[PDB]
């Protein structure tokens, strides 16, 4: 099952204000208009991480609550954990094995806490500086992602140094969601007067985009 990625998976490039500029960079990005896998909350498989990921979920009961990432995902060594515990957000790298089907029933070197509802995220590994970006909004559709622009906003950099080869999403249980991979791509951007990006081009998309 698929949806099109459209121009989804765009995120803020650096911590710099610029005045309305048509700026450019090469970075890990979601390939424009790629088809990307569609999932039904009947299923939360283990997926590769590869270079980096886009994830998004279309919800109203908000069944999605987190992700687990790492080498083993069974906690036999460190494995990254993220869970939005409602008003708050847990992050850990724990070797403690939680439930072997990993849902909330309705030692760690790091441990911390901070269909209309589309929640969107982007994840990448850079020299063990693991960077994450985000957005969430109401939308008027279940089956496919919205075609309009927005640059996702930084959550964290995690310089934790884990070999994240695999990951899986996490739930609260007694929705639909979508996943795809980033690629090193040359890009063009459109800032505004308030230091804020407002459109972008994947140069690697086609000869016009070049």
């Amino acid at each position: 099952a698929y949806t099109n990625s459209f121009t989804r998976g765009v995120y803020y490039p650096d911590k710099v204000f610029r005045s309305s500029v048509l700026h450019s960079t090469q970075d890990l990005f979601l390939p424009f208009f790629s088809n990307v896998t569609w999932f039904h909350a009947i299923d939360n498989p283990v997926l590769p991480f590869n270079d980096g990921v886009y994830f998004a979920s279309t919800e109203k009961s908000n069944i999605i609550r987190g992700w687990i990432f790492g080498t083993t995902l069974d906690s036999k060594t460190q494995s990254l954990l993220i869970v939005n515990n409602a008003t708050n957000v847990v992050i850990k790298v724990c070797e403690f094995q939680f439930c072997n089907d990993p849902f909330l029933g309705v030692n760690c070197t790091f441990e911390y806490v901070s269909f209309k509802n589309l929640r969107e995220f982007v994840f990448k590994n850079i020299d063990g500086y693991f960077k994450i970006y985000s957005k969430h909004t109401p939308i008027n559709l279940v089956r496919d992602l919205p075609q309009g622009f927005s640059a996702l906003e930084p959550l964290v950099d995690l310089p934790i140094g884990i070999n994240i080869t695999r990951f899986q999403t996490l739930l609260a249980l007694h929705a639909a969601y979508y996943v795809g991979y980033l690629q090193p791509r040359t890009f063009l951007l459109k800032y505004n007067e308030n230091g804020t990006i407002t459109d972008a081009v994947d140069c690697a998309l086609d000869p016009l985009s070049e």
Binding site: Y12, D14, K15, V16, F17, R18, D127, N194, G195, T196
Partner: protein
């Protein structure tokens, strides 16, 4: 002017000489209040470090220190730096520091730098060749060696392939050194990948242990979690000043900002991508860097043969920033304005022209394009000239130049 033109005599004209940058009025310093002491004392007096394949990436953050305690320290047998000089460390600010630290024999300490080779570099700790940081060590035969050999210290002697920059690997699996298919079994061409030093206190320097730290440095646009011991001033605005924010030196008008930032933006940047707006790290004040006014100094003069007097055009300047006369072209000091208009003489810009005249002074005026003339036109008017003249205008053209030649060889090499 005389020095710009490298001569004691100068003709009538208008001449570049300098740019008057309105001077930086004071030197601001601003840093995060992160002034608790860094654990470098515990690092450089550590009880021990790890065996070198498992080198300690000890992140150092959220603190400050006087590095002169360290770079003048009698502790070190080795103290080296890359992309930085140690005298500057007390001015520096860093996003993070990482004290990549371990024990090895003295013969392998020379492997610990960019471009270096051998199994400690290649199978235990490989630097980026694009490093920024420092390499520090002390001979530890006093503490790490023991009689009968201290075998608690180890290194990777073998691996299938060399380490990438900052790669780390704890695997104990048998190294297949050749055609023997090891299948987890040691033997001929099937070896354990680690080796133990067995440090005896009687060993010579080549086998004597060394405690080692490599300070890997991170410097990026995010707030400086580390600095040297240097102390902030108060903040200042709306004046041309010298400044530092978060280790970044700069100079400009620290204007109040109409430039709305996003919350995560520590800086804003020019078309040049040079820093162009800044945040006070403590006061969280977004400052907009308007340039310090930088007037090109066009000196206006008759010739020194004629007169010693002068006028000055600071190009693009408003006179308040510095008798005087403002223009669209900038601030004209020392000329005398005139309501009349004549033909131009020294051209200045935006229709302004000047000359020196009689009580003598340099007048400045808007130029006259010429005599103005209403023609006697109609549907029936004519004029026809009853008399005429011959005339002899003289036209001058260059047609050649002096044929030079150079032996590039004898010119360069004599």
């Amino acid at each position: 002017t005389k020095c710009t033109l490298k001569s004691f005599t100068v003709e009538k004209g208008i001449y570049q000489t300098s740019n008057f940058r309105v001077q930086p009025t004071e030197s601001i310093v601003r840093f995060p209040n992160i002034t608790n002491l860094c654990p470098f004392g515990e690092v450089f007096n550590a009880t021990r470090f790890a065996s070198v394949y498992a080198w300690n990436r000890k992140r150092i953050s959220n603190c400050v220190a006087d590095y002169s305690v360290l770079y003048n320290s009698a502790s070190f047998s080795t103290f080296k730096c890359y992309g930085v000089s140690p005298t500057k460390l007390n001015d520096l600010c860093f996003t993070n520091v990482y004290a990549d630290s371990f024990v090895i024999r003295g013969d392998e300490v020379r492997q610990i730098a960019p471009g270096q080779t051998g199994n400690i570099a290649d199978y235990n700790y490989k630097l980026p060749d694009d490093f920024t940081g420092c390499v520090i060590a002390w001979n530890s035969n006093n503490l790490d060696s023991k009689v009968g050999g201290n075998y608690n210290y180890l290194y990777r002697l073998f691996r299938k392939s060399n380490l990438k920059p900052f790669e780390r690997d704890i695997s104990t699996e048998i190294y297949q050194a050749g055609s023997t298919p090891c299948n987890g079994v040691k033997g001929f061409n099937c070896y354990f990948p680690l080796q133990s030093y067995g440090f005896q206190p009687t060993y010579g320097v080549g086998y004597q242990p060394y405690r080692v730290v490599v300070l890997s440095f991170e410097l990026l646009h995010a707030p400086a979690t580390v600095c040297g011991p240097k102390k902030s001033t108060n903040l200042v605005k709306n004046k041309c000043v010298n400044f530092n924010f978060n280790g970044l030196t700069g100079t400009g008008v620290l204007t109040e900002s109409n430039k709305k930032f996003l919350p995560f933006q520590q800086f804003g940047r020019d078309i040049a991508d040079t820093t162009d707006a800044v945040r006070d790290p403590q006061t969280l004040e977004i400052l907009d860097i308007t340039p310090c006014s930088f007037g090109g100094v066009s000196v206006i003069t008759p010739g020194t043969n004629t007169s010693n007097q002068v006028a000055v055009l600071y190009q693009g300047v408003n006179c308040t920033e510095v008798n005087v006369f403002q223009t669209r072209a900038g601030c004209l000091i020392g000329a005398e304005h005139v309501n009349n208009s004549y033909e131009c003489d020294i051209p200045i810009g935006a229709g302004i022209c000047a000359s020196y005249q009689t009580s003598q002074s340099i007048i400045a005026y808007t130029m006259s394009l010429g005599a103005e003339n209403s023609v006697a036109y109609s549907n029936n008017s004519i004029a026809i000239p009853t008399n005429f003249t011959i005339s002899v205008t003289t036209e001058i053209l260059p047609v050649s130049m002096t044929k030079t030649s150079v032996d590039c060889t004898m010119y360069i090499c004599g």
